[PDB]
Amino acid sequence: MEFMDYDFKVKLSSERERVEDLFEYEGCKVGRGTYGHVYKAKRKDGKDDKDYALKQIEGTGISMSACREIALLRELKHPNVISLQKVFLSHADRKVWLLFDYAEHDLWHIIKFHRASKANKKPVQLPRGMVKSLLYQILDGIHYLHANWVLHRDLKPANILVMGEGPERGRVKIADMGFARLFNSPLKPLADLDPVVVTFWYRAPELLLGARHYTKAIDIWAIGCIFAELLTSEPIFHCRQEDIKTSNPYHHDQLDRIFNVMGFPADKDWEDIKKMPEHSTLMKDFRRNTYTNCSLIKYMEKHKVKPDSKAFHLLQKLLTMDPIKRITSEQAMQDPYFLEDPLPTSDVFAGCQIPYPKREFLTEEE
């Protein structure tokens, strides 16, 4: 079967831009994940000296994650959302490669660096101007995404990149559209068509109680989780992996950690909790009295965040259990926390020395 005109085919093949002809990346892998691999790459022509990131998408062909990342990043344009420069399609192995400007840093590595300090009795918390500037730019990017009907659905420190030395020094880039949806995306009665998830530290409580809707409020919760982790260096709802994975929404231990931090919601705090699909499972497995002495105040107080601070008051509005009582991105940006000294800056490193090590190359066999 020859479905393509011969002359068309030879011309296409002659002119096709090939990733391995244009970029040098062999032995330059810097990340791996369910998404695929990321390489730090240089142009093989001498035409510029920039570092680029190449994302080799997991698997063969156009998976659902590949499709939505290409579709959405193709449309989107904002200083706090990673910009897709090019898509390379490699026809022989049916591999997809995405080209981006290289971001030396991200929040996973930044937080790790500070947590390592504290654990080394050589303690350094994240500077408070940097924390605020990061949060502001996260909120700015997600507000733009939301305004354009895109829900991210996988916000977490590894997905919040920060640009290093160069023309965009200290700028936040939200990355990885692999889980993203539009407001109006159909609800699939069975499993969400997403990559596998094994930890749920950033997942809003309504999801853990089986709510099926895609919402802006779900992203806002995750950003609250990130703000807390930036203030304290610890993932606030850290929880072990379950021994037995299942794909159903209810995760007992994750909920238990949440109630240990936040307390168990009273009827008046979250009236529609009774409407959650897993509400009777919650009543079966939990007793609200187990958590009577728990609250975000007490948790944050232990981690040297003062509960009368503007930072704490903002955090509490992001980490509100009832999604309908959760602050929006635009209201969060209007919060007086952002008017209090120091103002957020467009370079989150505020012109100062960056202490964070550069990414190292991954040389292991997979």
Binding site: M1, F8, I70, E75, H91
Partner: protein
Amino acid sequence: AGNFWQSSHYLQWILDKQDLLKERQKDLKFLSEEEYWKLQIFFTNVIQALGEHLKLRQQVIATATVYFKRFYARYSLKSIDPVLMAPTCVFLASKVEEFGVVSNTRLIAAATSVLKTRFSYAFPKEFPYRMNHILECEFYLLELMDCCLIVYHPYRPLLQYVQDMGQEDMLLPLAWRIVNDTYRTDLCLLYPPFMIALACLHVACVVQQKDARQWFAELSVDMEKILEIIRVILKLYEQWKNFDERKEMATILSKMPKPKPPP
């Protein structure tokens, strides 16, 4: 997906009519302009039938149709066989529109059964491609559309308009059906979808003898562009009357340029 004026659809895929006609000249050595339009309608009907068999919602079928029209707006009918391209467009659109990835057996069964049951006057032999061909054509389709996947349609703005009129129950079903019918033309390549919607609403108001001149007068839109679209719609119903696809399509298909084989 929230802002048409910043979209790839608007910035790359609203084409000039003259450039479009200029590109098509390569294929018009074999086909009259009339026959080229008939062939476009035919393939629109093929894609609609594939979507129905697979039980896909109208937005998926509409997106698939736009990919098909965009592809042959730039490239020759002989570049890739449209018999493969039509199901490939459905396959990709299903992913983009979040239905999911159609299984190997369901896709090939749909293409096979649809051509056999509903289009046997044009296709004497069974669908001749396998899933590997679809996957190969998908990669080509993706790159050749410059990776533009999000498509805006007239259905959303149509609904908003009828609601603004307060005439949803009365006008929507006809206006909606007219929107479906516009996929028989080039309009999706030529005009913003809200303008297509207004034109469709207008024709529906004409058909139902509903006076809404006031409401249309209160819109700040280029009424001259709307009138152009209305003329295309009225004209497509005259062509419909005069076209018998079942009697004509076998001959038209045999005149279509075929891909040159490898030497």
